[model samples]
Target chain A: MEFEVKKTFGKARLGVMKLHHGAVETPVFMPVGTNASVKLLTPRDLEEAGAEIILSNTFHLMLKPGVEIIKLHRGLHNFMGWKRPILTDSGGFQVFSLPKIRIDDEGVVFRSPIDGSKVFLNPEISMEVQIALGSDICMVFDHCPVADYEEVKEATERTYRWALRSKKAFKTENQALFGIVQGGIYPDLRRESALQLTSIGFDGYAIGGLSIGEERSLTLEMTEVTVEFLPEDKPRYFMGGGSPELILELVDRGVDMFDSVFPTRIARHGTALTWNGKLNLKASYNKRSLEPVDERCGCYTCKNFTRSYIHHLFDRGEVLGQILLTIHNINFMISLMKEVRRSIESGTFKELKSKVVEVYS
Target chain B: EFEVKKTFGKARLGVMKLHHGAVETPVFMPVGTNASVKLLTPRDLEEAGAEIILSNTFHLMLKPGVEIIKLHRGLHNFMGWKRPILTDSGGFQVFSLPKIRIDDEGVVFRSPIDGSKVFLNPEISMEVQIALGSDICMVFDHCPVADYEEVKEATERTYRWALRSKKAFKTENQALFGIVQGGIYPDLRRESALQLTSIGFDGYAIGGLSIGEERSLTLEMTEVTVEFLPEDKPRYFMGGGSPELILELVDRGVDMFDSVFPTRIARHGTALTWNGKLNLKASYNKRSLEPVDERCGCYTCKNFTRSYIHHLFDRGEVLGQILLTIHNINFMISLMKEVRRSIESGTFKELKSKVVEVYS
Candidate 1:
């Protein structure tokens, strides 16, 4: 993958990243597909919504269908029938988050949540899995710590060492490997981690370990501190943080990519994302309202369905309710990014940021 | 509004001009009991080439209620469907549910949604269907279960109820169909049909036959009921039998059919093939990458594979159910079109033999 910056207003840039599959505009928000499928959407729905890339979890795929089955179809793009670019996580967050796990230098071992079977993951194993999956981008395995000073210090030191091992183990030219910088609320540790990963050299850099349990301001502060020491030419990714407000803030700090489940997770609860704010369709006042979810949205759900109809579907516990809301939420994010890119290209990003704060606040 | 265009042997090709559009027969109407077909949308139904669908007055009146439906103008507007809708008169529930009470005037039953007592006679059924504003409405009639001495008494009451239902129906643009009900007794069926035809209706329906009886006896009852009905009007087989039974009845001259078997079985992970029914949940389908039916041209079959459907079923996804339901409804409608084409070409007997050989 190659990222070329075309224009910039302050630190907010308008650029394009050319991947093996297709070209994606920078400041893009990738929807999460923990399994091969996005919860209630088909690839056609994503393509129609103008999505260029999506993120999938290596932890879930390895457990459910296993690698052998995926190998039969060559890769995930064919197995899931999605031809777009995919980025697979290194199973670091999942392995560390398990209830019962043993973490050491060699690897981490945990019991599978699907069944109680045991599994082990190390840097080499994670790299092998990502290579076999044939994703365009693979993340290096790093220790992710919750908000704690001592734990954060230990994780930050080990993360750089693991980045070296991950880079050494990776041996594919078609897929690029990205390194993650982890430091929980400590600016000095964040700088040290970023400097070490940059010296080690990678295709891209990611700011991880924020959004774990920190306040919103601290998360932004940690991102700014870590991104300052990183090179500007390579793509910078913000892992697991993509609220409409947070995305704009990170874009101002020169962060280029993001992935989160906020859009789809809220949709399952019948919430819709709009420029004005999040509209909760399950509120009783919307029961008889005949308006669309968002009047400005051109999505299929907004074009064809009324609020009363969607409310009725939710009242009856129907699956169409979730399906429609997911489509709307994804469309809202993609369109929001498109507007952000347009503002940067036209030298009006500052005005757009002010409007985002007024509307999303 | 109904015309017989052509005939071959006993089968006839006909057309009915509904308010929404024209319906060519013999046609199968997919059952949508709750306004929405269980797992499909209106667009899916239209893409599958469905001309008309059947809904239940018994389910709608108790759930969304008449007030809510009237607020949206009618069912077609309320559900975002622009096609023709045929509504049952809530008569079948009187025989199906366990807690209903019958009388000469009307039937008294506790609401399945709640425990409140409800009374539905001929006038009320007409009132509910009129509020729904469907294209075709069925008259409320007494439905008997089996052949017995009580069958004669029920058949006589059905004739009386048909008269009351016809009198109460006053809608202009809608067509009302009279249902013929007489358990398994051929003579009672003849009496019910003769009495209903004398009163005159836009169409006639053979109702009480497929409620658990021998195939030969159901065929005999269908033939007896159909022979006495008018040849110019439409003939409907209510709550129908399987594909084999539908072909047999169409050959014996039934014009319209509605049932829930094709859709219900598909949701349970069984696919209807030209050769026979294939159980999709079996282990052999776990890795086989073949379409559900190689000879089928439906959206689901043309776009997805059996392995993918099996994976969705194992994952407990709702799209699997939706895709399979689309395929089955499309299959039934396509099969009906094939039968109609065969009849138009004067080769229905040969088509019947081919279908029976493949399906049975």
Candidate 2:
């Protein structure tokens, strides 16, 4: 797999990422499918909504179907009938976030969240699981601390050490491994983490441990500080952040990839992401409106369904409501990234960013 | 718009032409209570070979309301279904509502939505069906539970209400069917059927028998009521019986049927098979790689396995419900088609016996 930076305006770059499955044009927004299925959406729906790649959780898949079952079908791409490139997150964040877990230098031990059985996940196990799953891109197991500077300093040191261990354990020819930079909200710690990870060498670099309840300005500041030490040729991924405005800000900082559950999650609550702002379909004002969620969206839901009809679906507690809105919201995010790429190619990214802030603010 | 092509004993092969299209009898109409067949889409319904569907007047009126439906022009346009629709008169729901007061003029009950008092008589019911512009509108009739002294009075009131329903109906493009309601009394069933046939309608329906009654008694009441109704017009069995019972009723000369049994049981993870009903929630099905039914050719069985569907249900995915509902509706339509083929070939008796041996 090769990632090429084809064009750049200021810090924002328009690039193409070639993978074993297919090539994804940056900057791209990937929707999260925690399970094999992207809640309420089929692979066909995702393909129709312009998704080149989607992110799935190794933690969730390991808990439910397990690696053995997925391996029987060759890999997750075939298991879920999705032929596009997929990225699998290492179980580091999920294992550490468990209510009952013990973290040491070796690995993390915790009771399985799905059941109350004891399980262990370290860098080696994470690498083995991702290898068996055969994802196009595999993320390294790195410690992610909550937004606390004291814990962040300790977590950043552990994350750098784990990155080296994870790289040693990874032994796949087709799958690319990305190292994560975790330093909470401290700039110097982020710089140190980035330097250490770059020295170890990875296929890509990711900025993690931000968007864990940190202020928006601090998150962007941490990203800006960290990206400076990383190689400009390799792809830069921002983990777990996909707000349209935030994505534009990250793109301005040279981040090329992102994934989040924000769109699908908000859709389940009857919220739609639009250019102007978030529109709550459950509001009484939408009970009689004949307009789509967004007049500008060309998604199937926006083209075929009305706000009033979606409101009625929610009123009746139907899954089609979630299905429709999820399609629209994911399309909204992907379309936003597409527009961002266009603006970058045309040397008008700065103007587009200003407009995004004005509308999505 | 209806023609009987062949008959063997009491079983008949017939066709009824509606505004949407023609439907073959002994056809089964899947009940779509709230403008939808629970988890299936209109395209799914069409692929299942459904010629027509039945919707409730009470539930739709209370929720989206008549105005919203009319705004989209009609129920067919509002629900995105182009096929024929048969709407009940809301009389059955009004009679079944816990807080209900009945008079000779009309019936009043608390709305299920807001607990507000609402009155529905034959005239109002007819008006609602006409406003929805359904292909077939059912007349308002007083439904009784069991044989009692008051059932005779309810039967008399039902006859009177049927007259008012016919008088209030003014639409020419749409057809209206009168419901035959009698508590389980053979004489009352005969009297109700004769009065409705004399009053005249586009179709005839037998009501008030499938509500928790003995199998023999329900069949007896059906046979008694159907004997008095016209053979030339379409005879409908309302709130239908099971597949096995539907065959018996069809043999007793019933033309159309509607029931929520097939789809309702499917949501609970039960599959209708020719051999018998398969409870998909059974532990053995969790790892079985076989389809829901090997003989079935529905989309669910054609594409997915029992193990995969079980996994979806275990994960609480709505797709499981959607898949099961699709299979069950397809089974019903296929079963009806088989019955139609049997009647056309003069082998309905042999087919009925085989079905009863497997399903009953």
Candidate 3:
């Protein structure tokens, strides 16, 4: 596994990353494949939508089908028939979301959402599960806590300690490991955590605990502070930021990678992402419309389907509505990634960022 | 509008021209209950070589309703399909409901969608089908699939309804076909056919026999009904599109079929193949990377593996339903093509025998 920042404009880096499975250009946005499948779209759909990489959920996979069933097929790529690069999240953020949770210095113990059975996941177990899943990139398990300063300080300290255990336990050579930075909203604590984590080192660094519905200004501030302390050589992933407006701001702040469930999730509820704004497909205004969701975009959904037809699908409670909308949404993100990279190389990134912020913000 | 090109014993090869396009004889039409086939797109249907498809007047009128469809100019524009469409007359679906009121005038019931009071008879069916702008519209008939007394009453009442349906239809471009209804009784089926033929329609539809009757009885009653129908007019078998029944009914002189069997089972994760129906959810195929069927040319079968589909079904993905629906509908269309070719080359009996040997 290797990554190189080939081009840069301001703090934005137009980078190229080569993984065991394939190569993905950054500032790359990976679509989320929660159950080893992107909600309603197929692998071919994903590839055609320009997704070079997808992020699978560890907590969901370990609970639903279990690790043994996936182990039968070797990894998620074989199990889901997707041969592209895959990045898996540690059970950290998801476990924190669960209502019944008990955390200590070692790991988190929470009730399984599938059956309510108590389950334990720590740094060592997360590494084992991720390695068994055989993803191209794995995130180390860290304490993703709330915004309060005292809680953030304890969690931030424990995260550095856990990073040590995570680094020692990760033995798979082919898979690249990424460490997550957690400091809540405190810039000083964020700077301290990032500086301490680089000493242990990883193939990549992630800015977690931001964009969990935080204010936009603060998200950029925390990202800028965190990136200043990190090394320039490795990839810097901004976890869970996928909006057209937010991604541009993150790229401007030196974040190179991202993954989020919102783009695909909102699509299921009949929204489409476009350059101007999010187009809601369920509205009656589109009932008789024959125009595409985005005339400028060249996705299959845009090329072959009309807004009226898609709206009729949603009105009829059809799955194809969700399928078409998901394709367009993911394609919009992927298309944005290319345009951003091109903008960085040609020194027009700030202008591109202005276009996004104009309508999206 | 109807042309009988050739014949092999009882089987006939022909073509039916409609407002949209032309369709070859002995064709299989996939059912779209709500103006769209379950889990499939018009692109998928076209890629599978479908010439025409069927929609339900019952389901369409309830949802988006007749007024909404009228705003789109017709069902063709609303559904985004550019082929000939055959729509049922709301009789079969209405009778399938549990609580309903029936009399000499028409059937009255609460709407399945909004619980509003709705009444349907031959005249109203003609009006709705005309407004929907389907290429081939069916007449409203009293379809009975059970009890001898009920069959006798429905059969007698269907003749008057057929005459009324004929009187109410005034569309120049759209063709009208009459439905023949009876239980499993050969005598009742023969009487039903005689009444519809006496009234004289553009085409004849054999209905009510495919509903839960024994397989042999469906064919036997079909023989009686076909003997009474005119040879020049096209013969349609309603709700009878299983692979084996397709061959058998075609052998008994049926020219077209539309059924929900293939697409319905596809939603259950069943893939119709040359060998047999493959249950994709079974664990045995979980590790298999082979396509859903060998030598199949549909997009799903041509591009996807059984293992991926297996994983999708196991994980409860809607894409699995879409893929399987496309395959099954494609399989049925391909089967129809082979059936038509066999009839042309005088090898239909051999093909029918092969199908029976495998499917029986």
Candidate 4:
């Protein structure tokens, strides 16, 4: 549970997070590996691509094999054969997203999409499931409110209460619980949620409600306001803040961790993140571009393959299109974190952030 | 050198050295119905790790005509695939499907496409595969439905046809495989196996399984038939699969399987995942940003995601099927390789337990 600060520049800091499974460098970006395995990339592929850790959804695994099955196989690491540290997201996002679901103060009730059986997942159930699954890190079951304010005030209050319940339910010494702060576009509520979760004394705190379609500026503003009140010692995870530009800005605002499906999602659509910008692989202009998607990227795709070949695979509807992009995207994030760390160590955060915005803008 | 090379447990991984190239054994042959595996080419097949291919004698005989394939110097030259080719006995196709003229002498059927009378017997079936000049020729066995009682008479008739097929295979270059057919009855299966073994053919095929019988019964019948067949010759189990079934049968001592599962399912927007099969057409995968299988090191898994493939399937692109076909085929072949490795390592039982844990 030791957190060592390697470097700092104004609000930005570079640190190392030590956990039971492995160490995660601060300003780390976790790729989603739902269903025990990441789609398209293997454990070896993730390791080779330089991923320190990954996040898997508890809801998907629980529904498919249930907690007992994973436990029989000796947890996700032995079952999927990925030995790296894993973070399990509480079933809250998925349960809340179900259109046919019923929500109450005690817990959320929903019909199982698989077998149409009724199921309930509250803070206690979510904690029990994660503990049984044995994740190194677990998220709180906070209600994520959308950007619009139908019941934003009530939603924000419920999230804080849920955070407290999540903290009380967590009993595993190996697994640390992170409180998720939720407030829809309201600065005062965002502060209130963050302050409340901080008061509950969780291992860390996350800004959750911002990414559910808030304007880019508003999202960053929310991160700044929440981080302003959160303890400087603990890590700050910006949940689902996926865009490279957003990550760079968030890191500038002192966020330490990030996770999203964006890089891998866009990669599936024949898109690649480049040092210059994004390049759509299916575009006719890339028909002859023999250069890698990013000349600066040292990823396996950039190292071994050409855009022309990837484009052909995309045209042919080859799976290699998304796989290669997933590799590059993960590598892109890792490389970005490395650069951020290096800049922080050099005491030149202002210069680096300005340059990053200039290039991405 | 291509005949029988090695054996581990009941599984045999041999080399069928051919004019094009030597194909390794315990290898599953893909059925290229119309000189292609439905939606795949020989090139795609080769890339997907196919070393040998199986073609339908009935289809080729009807469409390209044996003479046309022969005019191009056999199917190898016609399809531009140099791998070893195994041509099925046209008798099965002639008996099943379309208009049928079944008599004691032979069976006559109308063409499926144009409705023309086509006659086939043991001699005609042998003549067709020879004209096509495949490396391995399958003797025409009367493939009856798995109705046990009805298959007894067909089994005896098939044994008679095997002798007729053996006499008619005049080509010295082509090796013929005697097919074992007896439906689900083990007695009939044993009898057919013994009869075909006595006829002394180059190989044996366990046909008519994976039709409608219980999977357990199919595997049981397959084990019984293969146990009676000579270990030195090749044994092909036709039309039994999914990745799960393939590995299970391979462990049960059946070599060389071909089914429409991979390509057919691929066209329907499904993929063979490590855990199980995935129908990518499901809307849940629409926004999924992960690859088909993170643990699969194959070309497809190494390059694509569930969301991308799902999108392609949704968009109704032919490439989706092709990519899925590639993944499925590779998954099958790789499973075989793992099976072989496990058998070699003396850890096959352990391997089986691991596979069944997820896939079963």
Q: lDDT tens string, model 4, A168-236? A: 888887888888887777888888988888888888788887777668989888889899999888999
DockQ-sorted candidate list, best first? 3, 1, 2, 4
| Per-candidate fnat, comma-separated | 0.00, 0.08, 0.36, 0.00
lDDT of 2 by residue, B55-79 (tens): 9988887778888877777888766
Among these predicted structures, which one has the highest lDDT?
Answer: 3
Report DockQ per prediction, comma-separated: 0.35, 0.34, 0.41, 0.04
lDDT of 1 by residue, B39-91 (tens): 67777789789999999889778766788778778888767778899999977
Each candidate: RMSD: 2.7, 2.8, 3.1, 11.4
Ordered from best to worst TM-score, the candidate numbers read 1, 2, 3, 4
Docking class of 1: acceptable
Residue A339 error, candidate 2, Å: 3.3
Candidate 3, A172-220: lDDT as tens digits = 8789999999898899999999988998899999999998877888999
Residue pairs in candidate 1 whose N, alpha carbon or C atoms collide under 3 angstroms:
none
**What is the DockQ score, from 0 to 1, of model 4?**
0.04
lDDT of each residue in B1-360, candidate 3, tens digit only: 788888998889999988899999889999987778877778889989999999998977777678878877889987779899999997778878878888889999998877888899999999999999999999999887567998899988888899999999998789999999878878888888888888888899998877787888889988989989999999999886888888999999999998898888988989888887789988887767678879689878766678768867877878788888988998999999998898899999998997887677
For candidate 1, the C-alpha RMSD (Å) to the true structure equals 2.7
lDDT values for all models: 0.85, 0.86, 0.87, 0.77
Candidate 4 residue lDDT tens string, B1-360:
345444556655566666667777667777766665655545557876788788887766766466556555667765557778888776556655855767567887777757878778889888888888888888877888745678988898899999999999898678888989898999999999999898898888888787788989988998999889877767788776556676677766676777777777877887877677788889887655567877677656765557556655654545567678878877777776776666666676776776777677
Minimal lDDT window, size 10, model 2 chain A:
A144-153
